[PDB]
Design a protein around this nucleic acid. Structure first.
Length: 116
DNA sequence: CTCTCGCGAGAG
DNA sequence: CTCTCGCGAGAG
């Protein structure tokens, strides 16, 4: 619902209420991202940085499972990335499976940075 | 920085 | 048991 982020933007197709998610990204920032992120792979990781602070990435993963006892990244927010990539690039479930590896791998990089 | 792959420990 | 999947870290 728009109200959760009054100065924010929609992830995915605003005219399609089942595949939209209100988010905290401001219009000027969402403009930068669409200008700069010309592939689903590059938009996914840039969305990640605008939706989650690096300090959340360094403690969090997609499942919230594993040996490091990591927090799970907000599932509604992750669904919102899925909705933006499907809308912006018409990616498939097989692409999204690949993208999710890459989000988790970025999150491990951040954990390893805090580590080192 | 991103992308990837072999590993092996718990989930099923 | 088999299967999934979180993981470290070398290579791009």
């Amino acid at each position: 619902s728009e109200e959760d982020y009054p100065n924010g933007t929609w992830l995915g197709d605003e005219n399609n209420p089942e595949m939209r998610v209100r988010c905290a990204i401001i219009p000027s920032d969402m403009l930068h991202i669409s200008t700069n992120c010309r592939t689903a792979e590059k938009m996914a990781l840039t969305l990640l940085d605008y939706l989650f602070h690096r300090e959340v990435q360094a403690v969090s993963n997609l499942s919230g499972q594993g040996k490091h006892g990591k927090k799970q990244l907000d599932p509604l927010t992750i669904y919102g990335i899925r909705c933006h990539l499907f809308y912006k690039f018409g990616i498939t479930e097989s692409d999204w499976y690949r993208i999710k590896q890459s989000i988790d791998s970025k999150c491990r990089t951040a954990w390893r940075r805090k580590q080192r």
